[PDB]
Amino acid sequence: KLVRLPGLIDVHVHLREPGGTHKEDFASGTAAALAGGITMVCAMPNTRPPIIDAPALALAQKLAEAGARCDFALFLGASSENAGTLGTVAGSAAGLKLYLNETFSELRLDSVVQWMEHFETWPSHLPIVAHAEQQTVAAVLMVAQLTQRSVHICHVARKEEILLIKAAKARGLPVTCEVAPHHLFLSHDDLERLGPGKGEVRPELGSRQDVEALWENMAVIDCFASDHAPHTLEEKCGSRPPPGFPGLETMLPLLLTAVSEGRLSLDDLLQRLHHNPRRIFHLPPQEDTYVEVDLEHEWTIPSHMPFSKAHWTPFEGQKVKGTVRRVVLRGEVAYIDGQVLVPPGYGQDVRKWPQGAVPQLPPS
Amino acid sequence: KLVRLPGLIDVHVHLREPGGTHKEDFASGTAAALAGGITMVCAMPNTRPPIIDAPALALAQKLAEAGARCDFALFLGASSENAGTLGTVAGSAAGLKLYLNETFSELRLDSVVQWMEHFETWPSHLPIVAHAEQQTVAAVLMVAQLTQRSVHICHVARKEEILLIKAAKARGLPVTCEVAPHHLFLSHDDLERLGPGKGEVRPELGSRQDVEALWENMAVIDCFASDHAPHTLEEKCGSRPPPGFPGLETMLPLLLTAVSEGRLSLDDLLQRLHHNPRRIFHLPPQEDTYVEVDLEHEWTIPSHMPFSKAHWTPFEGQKVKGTVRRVVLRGEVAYIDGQVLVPPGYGQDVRKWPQGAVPQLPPS
Ligand SMILES: NC(=O)N[C@@H](CC(=O)O)C(=O)O
Ligand SMILES: NC(=O)N[C@@H](CC(=O)O)C(=O)O
Ligand SMILES: [Zn+2]
Ligand SMILES: [Zn+2]
Ligand SMILES: [Zn+2]
Ligand SMILES: [Zn+2]
Ligand SMILES: [Zn+2]
Ligand SMILES: [Zn+2]
Ligand SMILES: [Zn+2]
Ligand SMILES: [Zn+2]
């Protein structure tokens, strides 16, 4: 007996095209998405070239339209030079991404004044998301209040961060957040097994107490999002390992295992992988789109999942219960039992759909 | 023709007693204060032992009462263990100091939740000051808003920081700040002369653009305070130089030079070294207390000032115009032309004066 889910949405993926296509490209990354029960992804802008201007966005749009197998929206990235220049293309993007700490990213800003300039100039009705760790969460929340708008915090990983967000929500502040599966299912306890290179990720893996705090504060978590951050094994195991884990193919199986164990409900999962992503990012429905999962199937995560070019996974050896059996995307069979059945280019930019534009008031 | 000033107040000094008395002690540091035209100082808690509990405060009070030559108040320091424990002694302190970044300090906190706990537990009517650099300024402002109270930002040193505070004030937020003389009168341009050890200070010396921004935004600066941070030349020039500059003896001459050049007015100076310190920290008046200065005397800062045990100065070689000629403290001549004339122990804890208690509403 399969369970039918709606088309799940991952609002934080790195698909590496343009410029990093040995790690992943639109075709491989969206195959990984479909195999993970994900029918829509929002791709981050830290590519090469980074998506920080209109010409780079135009290129990325075409590469995505040609390569994507599932539907998508593309983020713009904030830079030290582009505040006040993105107005004509802003509405065509998923939102604006701010990189406020050291990580795999033309995009760390050097001053909080630059953050303020982005919050002041980016259209007020469009999403802003931030990589903001530890005190940076409080800092960016202050900037959002000064500029009287909302902000979404990416990959929350620590007790400190979730409790700060909880306190902000208790004061009625417009903040939402997401959590990635590695911060729910891995911790410091796993670093011995992973080793120092594979274990590199930002935010770093947390203590058992961090992980426990995220679970205890599930009510504070608006979305799950993979932060699918593919790098090859050679890169992860080499002399300057880049941070990040692949995660599209493992996210849903990990979370279904948790549902089966009663750690959260099916509804809790679907709020966080479907309804809240839609409402925070104003992402449109996908007609005749659904995912069929088998909740009874027990399996062990192998040393690499079939689709991501990363060709490794930090979840190797974990026992999971739950598998994606079939995905239908806009009336076509997209995935069955390990086979992707839609070609590169089947996917579409949801921001071009009439229903995918973010509503806004008319010029004065 | 001498100009009579009121008794000036320095709300940020490190007097090193207990535990660092080769660098300074209450007697030498307050001699330095008097020679700099300062009749009241607020001493920071990063001593050895640090002033983070009632017994340490009791010790420091007695050492100060016995050694101080000018009047004083003593800060308590926030630690990772003392939130909720300082209520009985809080009103006897200058205020609570939070160390939120790496510097010469049992006192960096590890989580913003610890900051929140201090803001929630410290009595709401008493001062809180923070060492908070760059984005940390925005973060601590967020914590202050979440807990609906004020905060004072120590030694603002950067364009980024003063502009953030300016934006907060424009939104009516209860934030005040101070600036130290080295951030007004030294910059990166001076690092070649100072060298890497002597030049170590937190916040670090800024660019010419940082310095220019502080001057341009003088209206945003509530107080001047030295951050007198004495260390010996051996320590500054050794293999692990501690950050900090001595500054009590040079602050007023530097600022008087600026007044003489029309960079700020005498009133601007007195707001920042007298009236605003009084009102932010609820420091009492000092009866029959004044400072006589000679505004015409030109001199060059020597390699060390006479009183601080630091026995060096980063302002060596700067030409100044303005000198402290006489200080009268509570009806006694305390300083004349290079001679301190009040003994260790003349100074008093202003928080013990009836007029030095911070006003508060009665228990419910
Ligand atoms: N999270 C990571 O460790 N890496 C991400 C970047 C990011 O989300 O910050 C990547 O693009 O590789
Ligand atoms: N400012 C410094 O560089 N050092 C100060 C500490 C401080 O004010 O942070 C000290 O106590 O030495
Ligand atoms: Zn990130
Ligand atoms: Zn994100
Ligand atoms: Zn990311
Ligand atoms: Zn909507
Ligand atoms: Zn400091
Ligand atoms: Zn201070
Ligand atoms: Zn200090
Ligand atoms: Zn008062």
Nearest to A139 among B142, B163, B168 (CB): B142
Selecting from A100, A141, A167 the residue whose C-beta is nearest the C-beta of B116 gives: A167
Q: How far is A189 from chain B (nearest CA, A)?
A: 21
Residues 6+ apart with CB under 8 A from A26: A15, A17, A63, A64, A66, A67, A68, A69, A72, A344, A347
Q: What are phi and psi of A217, to 5 degrees?
A: -105, 35
How many CB atoms sit inside 10 A of residue B52's CB?
A: 23
Q: Where are the beta strands (DSSP E) in B124-174?
A: 128-131, 151-153
Output the six-digit token pair for B327.
Answer: 């200080």
Paired residues of B5 in beta bridges = B291
Active-site position among B227, B267, B288, B294: B227
Residue A291: name the closest of A269, A264, A316 by CA. A269
C-alpha Rg value of chain B to the nearest Å: 19
Contacts of residue B6, Cβ cutoff 8 Å, sequence gap at least 6:
B270, B274, B289, B290, B291
Answer for the pair A287, A71: CB distance below 8 angstroms, yes or no: no
- E strands, B120-250, where? 128-131, 151-153, 175-179, 223-224
Query: Mutate which of B135, B148, B149, B164 to test chain A, going by most A C-beta atoms within 10 A?
Result: B135
Contact criterion met (CB below 8 Å) for A67 and A17: yes
Chain B positions touching A136 (Cβ under 8 A) are 135, 139
DSSP class of B350:
G
Contact between A99 and A77 (Cβ < 8 Å): yes
Closest CA in chain A for residue B168: A146
Binding positions of A are 12, 14, 16, 46, 97, 131, 154-155, 178, 202, 227, 231, 243
Check whether domain A1-364 has CATH 3.40.50.300, yes or no: no
φ, ψ of residue A220 to 5 degrees: the values are -85, -15
Asked if B77 contacts B47 with a C-beta cutoff of 8 angstroms, the reply is no
Question: Exposed, middle or buried: residue B316 (CB in 10 Å: 0-12, 13-18, 19+)?
Answer: middle
Summary count for chain A: helices (H), strands (E): 12, 14
Taking CB atoms and an 8 Å limit, are A136 and B141 in contact across chains? no
Strands of the sheet containing A332-336, edge to edge, are A3-6, A290-300, A319-329, A332-336, A339-340
In angstroms, the first-to-last Cα distance of chain A is 55
Specify the experimental method: X-ray
Query: How many Å apart are CA A78 and CA B128, to the nearest integer?
Result: 34
Resolution (angstroms) equals 1.3
Residues in A touching B134 (Cβ below 8 Å): 111-112
Residue A93: closest CA among A127, A116, A120: A127
Q: Reduce the DSSP state of residue A17 to 3 states and report it.
A: coil
Q: Which residues of A touch B160 (CB under 8 A)?
A: 111-113
